[PDB]
Design a protein around this ligand. Structure first.
Ligand SMILES: O=C(O)[C@H]1OC(=O)[C@H](O)[C@@H](O)[C@@H]1O
Ligand SMILES: O=C(O)[C@H]1OC(=O)[C@H](O)[C@@H](O)[C@@H]1O
Ligand SMILES: [Ca+2]
Ligand SMILES: [Ca+2]
Ligand code: NA
Ligand code: NA
Lengths: 840, 837
């Protein structure tokens, strides 16, 4: 029979080049011991310049004696970006492509009397393999399962593009009936003739046997026999949807015709459904209107990168499934078998694509390698009924149009780009006639003007109005313009989203403060547009997770923080705005404050400090309590309500209540509240650490110190705050702090900062980062109540640009105010943070 | 006058030795930019062999023109383990000790016409500097503040063992009156004499002037001058406790005698309190009985090491204070000024000690460096009224008794130890006659036999009965035997605790399973003993935090996990047990399930699955609800109550309430629950991932995958479980897994593992790790051989994780895995089953 098991254990690993690494007699005792899956690019979660090059893997294979007469097939589900395989020093074969599987019949290279050496040379530097550009990390290593499969000399073909070698499709599907087509190849690796029996057994969703198909086949020595068997038409087929994922098991068995001995067996699911995309009326599933409620999912997890175990892929899926999504855009690369299994079985429509992104280079072999990767993806995943569309390109004009601004520079690149698109479109439709082709665009009409949008069956727009410029309403405007000018191109919003940082909150959220609240304002705008516009087939949110992009700075360097869930897969609050809107079958009532559990605020006297607490829910009406006090009931709109909550106590308990389908629904949590006095005196200074996010309207809570830094405020008589200057903001990474966001904002041209406070000894901490690398170069003095504390401070000369300075001073105040004045010398005065404590 | 500011910023740094690193014109462009505080030992949070050696720090000094005629004093509050200071290439000084400060008048080497180069060479390799052994990482680098203080040529001495040069004490303190003594040194670095007015201003707690001393003094060029000025006795003085931290500010000022212009100035707090330790009745503060409710606290935080900013120090102090502690054992080394500031001002009694641990080696120069470190600690922190006791040794016999067995071998080592001990003891009492001396013992009467327990004023026992062997009840038995045999040695339990791991839970918690629940068990037993035994002066819990100890393996390698709060300072549920028992001023009601938010259990049919939910509270009666259904009222004992809670829904809401001094009190949280079926069939297998922590009574929940692995259960008809074997357990780290504990337990001599299950195709994952440092065995499934001869230790080695997956076709009504040993034993560390087709 067939024995399939992993060989993920007991590997030795070496980063870099190594002469002789494939020899069986090599001494790899000093190499690193590892267990697949594996990447050598954990460094990308800190370092922007992560290592791209060569890495070697070694494993001993001591084969079972019971396998002496079988064919041994080696399968690498993934190696990024390329792999060359060695058995006992001999080059067995290679593979180009970091997200498709490859497979090899290694039987002629193996020995059953002595042990064998399997060595793999992996490379993530090759410029002739996609992607060569794109907003994610190109991790190197063997980060998916590796298998050995042992079969008898007659077995299904396992070396057709690293696939299962079988291909099952439904040529016709209606409510009344459907046809079923069962195809594949049998391979005869014996030196003589073989007379076999092929059997297809087809089961209903409930497990009962529907039909058995039997053919005799004769194979000459060494022959590959293609079979194509049609089943009896299936009457009143049970139709598949993400809500009702009815599967029909197809068991395909190979038997010795004489002896009836079982040789090989391969199992697959098929399912019966049909779909359609309409430019006016959107998407239809089994003849009914169906809004695609989608998410995109990258495949890494900080800090192990793409080296996920399969229960991790399943965990990601359950989260997406429990949120209400019925559609996943698997991007920008094809992903784990374990993922697609859940899409079929638990129910989720799928788009899947290869990563041809940003720009079509002029690299020999690139086109050819793209073609092979498209075939490998379609053939490896042909049997997943959840998949309805293949794609091969994403924003293929984005870098082209940035780099080249002349007609002469552009013409060749566009020509090369349209030729490869048309090339791949032909390959797609010849690989698979049962599915729709798609392509994803960045937000520009150049895709219509260049002809790129005239190629695939449907089109996707990556739209970010209200995040990367423009206003939120430019999103529906853009879609309306496209539908007017190209009404026959059915439309998916293949990317939309906005960045967010658990550390940052704002009562006045604005784009690129990275506050939790701004991403919610953005998503709260976009989802109803997606739900209620008929010519929008659906959208796929970007992205389900905060994911690795080594090249990103912004509020969380190395991470693209547009997730609905943090990197470690804890959900953000806004996850439950999706759930509330997309799950009708359960009550959803979520106090939107897990993202904001450490609050602080400026208190007048002993009066409460008010701060919004938002709720996400599908209940019509909710009541909010704090420490047992009701704040009233509110009517929900767009799945949300916001209460102005009076905080006083240090550890308040928040509690929410409503009715859903005649039952009581409840939620609650404790958070922390810290009051900071607006007017300082001897009493209220004891224990006070007054910290201010100068130049920002965001509260910043360090996930390292747990200290919250308050939004800046202007100086007022009896209080404290700034004097002069204007807000400034950088996105560049800030050296030498864990609290980047605090230093990315400053008050530029500041004139002073003042606290009215009693007489005593105070510790003053100032925070500096020069964000104007443009610079002349800022240098300035600083005094406090007229006592110079810096004669000529220049952060960029002493430390450089975009680097933290935190300087503490002890000062004796003999006034009733602490007046910090800035005194220009060159460039501008600025201040990114201030923090005050009373010492004596 | 005096300006103090930091130079923590704008450093370059290079790991290792370097030719010509102190040269003013050395090229450090390609060095790593860093900002103090800093450590080069972040590696210690993953690598056991952390880098111990040399590191180089360079920063430019551009002196303000206003300092031209001032004295510049450099201060390094801490550098581990030793540091040497260059200014413009010239050796200025060096210091030995990684937890005390050092200072140098650097004026002679500085220019004011050109930038100055500051270079510091640091070394955490040196074996002649305490500690040379002990249960924590010897972090290297400059991990506390660095200061420049500029003063006039007539200034208080700032180069007396890196202290402030002033020393304030109260010779007599009673309810009616107290005496106050103010001492210090004035130095005169001018090239000729000078005439000064020295003034002490003393302020009440409410900020009012109580008294002004003034004394005239003259100093010849380059002379230092010692003063000691008694003060008018203070009448009906405001006493200080953790609860009432009444402090008197003392301002000391230096004015030129003719021009009366102010020169230098230094502020310090004093306070009025007395105390004593009674071998029979415990501890007394201001004449009243007082239970010492202490915790110990290491100073690092994963993964930044001890490179903490001062708000992190203050954050730590607040959690300890909000938990209700009144005592803190600052160990095993003196800690940050920022922390001590809070013990004075917000109120916590303090024990502070230097890290002389495990064994007094024969290492040239070790003794001398120890004595200097003791002098330093005491001089540097002399003015902190929170401190009532100094110490210098912890468990100084522990490694000595492992390494040397015979009387002949022990002789010299014991001689060195008693000598070093008595020597430091006498240095302590020279340095400070106002505080109590202490030492900390491990749990052996040999500290008595060898005479070590006669030396200090009080003794500390680090006791671990119920964790490192023995029984929970051995704790009180050990202490009652000491009291019987040494009634005049007043006792503090200076350490006690149990490891815990958020990933691990058990309905039957046992020591060294590292379950949340066992730590709670251990502590719930110890704390009443501490509270209710009067000859126990108090205790200090070990430890307040999970902290770095690179040499440790066990469930969380590199980490000692006996904290009350995780390394990131999130509290464990048990933290609120202490808070229930030590805070009577407020209501405490805490559902003890923040450590257990991801639950799973074997479900019979569709009946609910019972799992305990514990509650910590100072109320006498609590009610627990799940998803709105009440589970009754329960009377609390020992600040806690447990409910058998019926789980069913996937995302249940837990809710508790009761009454405290009139008011209604509430708490709630959501958690996640995943039922696993006891009897598998075609329906319940859809989406099922049956994962079993084979060999263990703990649920293990990966913090990497979030999957929960169930307690092993024996096979029963109609269900699933193991067949044969016994539990086996290792504490050695496991390579190549983030889920160590999963692999550190196993079923040894296992015969089979069986699932009753429908026909179909199944994915079976087997987890192996050989912990027995050669086992070899075949594995069959339903009569088909799936491994002819598997030997984990030959394929992978010992203590290395093996995860193997197989696709299996079951044409029977069960899945029968069998183990056939041909050598060594058969073992299996975990299994996980999915149905595929
Ligand atoms: O900027 C972003 O968030 C993303 O936006 C896009 O349009 C890209 O297709 C995607 O790869 C980037 O990650
Ligand atoms: O092993 C432990 O947990 C502790 O035991 C002790 O008694 C040691 O003094 C301490 O440094 C250790 O950390
Ligand atoms: Ca996989
Ligand atoms: Ca400090
Ligand atoms: Na700021
Ligand atoms: Na186990």
């Amino acid at each position: 029979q067939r024995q399939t098991q992993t060989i993920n254990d007991s590997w030795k690993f070496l980063k870099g080049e190594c002469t002789a690494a494939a020899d069986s007699a090599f001494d790899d005792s000093k190499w690193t011991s590892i267990h697949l899956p594996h990447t050598w690019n954990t460094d990308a979660y800190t370092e922007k310049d992560y290592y791209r090059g060569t890495g070697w893997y070694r494993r001993q294979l001591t084969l079972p004696q019971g396998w002496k007469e079988k064919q041994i097939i080696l399968r690498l589900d993934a190696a990024g970006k390329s792999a060359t395989i060695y058995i006992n020093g001999k080059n067995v074969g290679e593979h180009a492509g970091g997200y498709t599987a490859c497979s090899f019949n290694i039987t002629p290279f193996l020995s059953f009397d002595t042990p064998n050496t399997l060595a793999v040379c992996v490379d993530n530097a090759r410029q002739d393999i996609a992607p060569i550009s794109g907003d994610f990390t190109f991790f190197g290593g063997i980060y998916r399962d590796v298998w050995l499969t042992a079969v008898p000399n007659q077995h299904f073909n396992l070396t057709n593009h690293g696939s299962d070698g079988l291909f099952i499709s439904t040529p016709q599907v209606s409510e009344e009936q459907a046809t079923l087509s069962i195809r594949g190849e049998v391979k005869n690796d014996a030196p003589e003739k073989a007379t076999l029996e092929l059997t297809h057994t087809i089961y209903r969703p409930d497990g009962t046997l529907l039909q058995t198909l039997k053919k005799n086949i004769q194979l000459k020595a060494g022959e590959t026999y293609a079979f194509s068997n049609e089943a009896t038409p299936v009457l009143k087929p049970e139709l598949w949807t993400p809500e009702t994922p009815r599967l029909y098991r197809v068991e395909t068995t190979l038997r010795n015709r004489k002896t009836k001995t079982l040789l090989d067996q391969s199992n697959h699911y098929t399912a019966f459904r049909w779909f359609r995309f309409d430019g006016d009326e959107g998407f239809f599933l089994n003849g009914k209107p169906y809004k695609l409620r989608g998410i995109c999912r990258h495949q890494d997890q900080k800090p192990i990168g793409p080296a996920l175990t399969d229960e991790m892929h399943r965990r990601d899926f359950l989260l997406m499934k429990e949120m209400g999504a019925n559609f996943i855009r698997i991007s920008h690369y094809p992903q784990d078998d374990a993922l697609l299994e859940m899409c079929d079985k638990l129910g989720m429509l799928a788009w899947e694509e290869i990563p041809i992104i940003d720009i079509v280079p002029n690299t020999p072999g690139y086109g050819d390698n793209c073609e092979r990767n498209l075939r490998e993806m379609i053939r490896q995943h042909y049997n997943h009924p959840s998949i309805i569309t293949w794609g091969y390109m994403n924003e293929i004009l984005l870098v082209t149009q940035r780099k080249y601004k002349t007609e002469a520079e552009l013409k060749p690149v566009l020509e090369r780009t349209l030729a490869l698109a048309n090339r791949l479109e032909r390959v797609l439709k010849e690989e698979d006639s049962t599915r729709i082709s798609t392509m994803a665009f960045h937000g520009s009409n150049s895709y219509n003007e260049t002809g790129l949008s005239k190629i695939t069956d449907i089109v996707g727009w990556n739209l970010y109005q209200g995040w990367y410029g423009g206003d939120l309403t430019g999103f529906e405007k853009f879609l309306a313009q496209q539908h007017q000018n190209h009404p026959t191109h059915p439309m998916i919003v293949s990317e939309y989203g906005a960045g967010s940082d658990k550390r940052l909150h704002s009562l006045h959220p604005r784009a690129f403060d990275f506050s939790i609240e701004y991403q919610q304002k953005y998503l709260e705008h976009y989802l109803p547009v997606l739900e209620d516009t008929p010519y929008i087939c659906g959208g796929t949110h970007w992205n389900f997770i905060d994911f690795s992009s080594a090249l990103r700075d912004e509020s969380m360097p190395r991470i693209n923080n547009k997730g609905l869930v943090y990197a470690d897969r804890t959900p953000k609050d806004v996850y439950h705005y999706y759930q509330a809107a997309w799950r009708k079958d359960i009550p959803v009532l979520h106090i939107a404050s897990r993202d904001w559990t450490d609050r602080a605020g400026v208190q007048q006297g002993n009066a409460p400090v008010y701060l919004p607490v938002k709720i996400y829910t599908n209940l019509s009406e909710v009541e909010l309590f704090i420490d047992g006090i009701s704040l009233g009931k509110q009517k929900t709109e767009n799945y949300t309500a916001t209460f102005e909550v009076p905080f006083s106590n240090r550890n308040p308990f928040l509690f929410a209540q409503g009715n859903y389908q005649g039952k009581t629904v409840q939620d609650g949590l404790r958070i922390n509240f810290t009051p900071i006095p607006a007017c300082l005196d001897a009493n209220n200074l004891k224990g006070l650490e007054l910290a201010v996010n100068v130049g920002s309207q965001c509260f910043f809570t360090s996930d390292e110190s747990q200290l919250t830094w308050l939004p800046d405020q202007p100086y007022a008589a009896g209080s404290w705050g700034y004097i002069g200057g204007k807000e400034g903001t950088a996105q560049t990474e800030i050296q030498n702090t864990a609290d980047g966001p605090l230093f990315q904002t400053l008050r530029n041209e500041i004139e002073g900062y003042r606290f009215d406070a009693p007489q005593g000894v105070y510790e003053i901490e100032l925070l500096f980062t020069d964000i104007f690398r443009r610079n002349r170069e800022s240098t300035f003095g600083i005094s406090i109540n007229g006592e110079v504390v810096e004669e000529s401070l220049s952060p960029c000369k002493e430390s450089g640009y975009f680097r933290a300075l935190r300087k503490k001073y002890y000062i004796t105040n003999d006034k009733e105010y602490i007046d910090i004045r800035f005194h220009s010398t060159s460039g501008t005065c600025f201040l990114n943070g201030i923090k005050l404590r009373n010492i004596y």
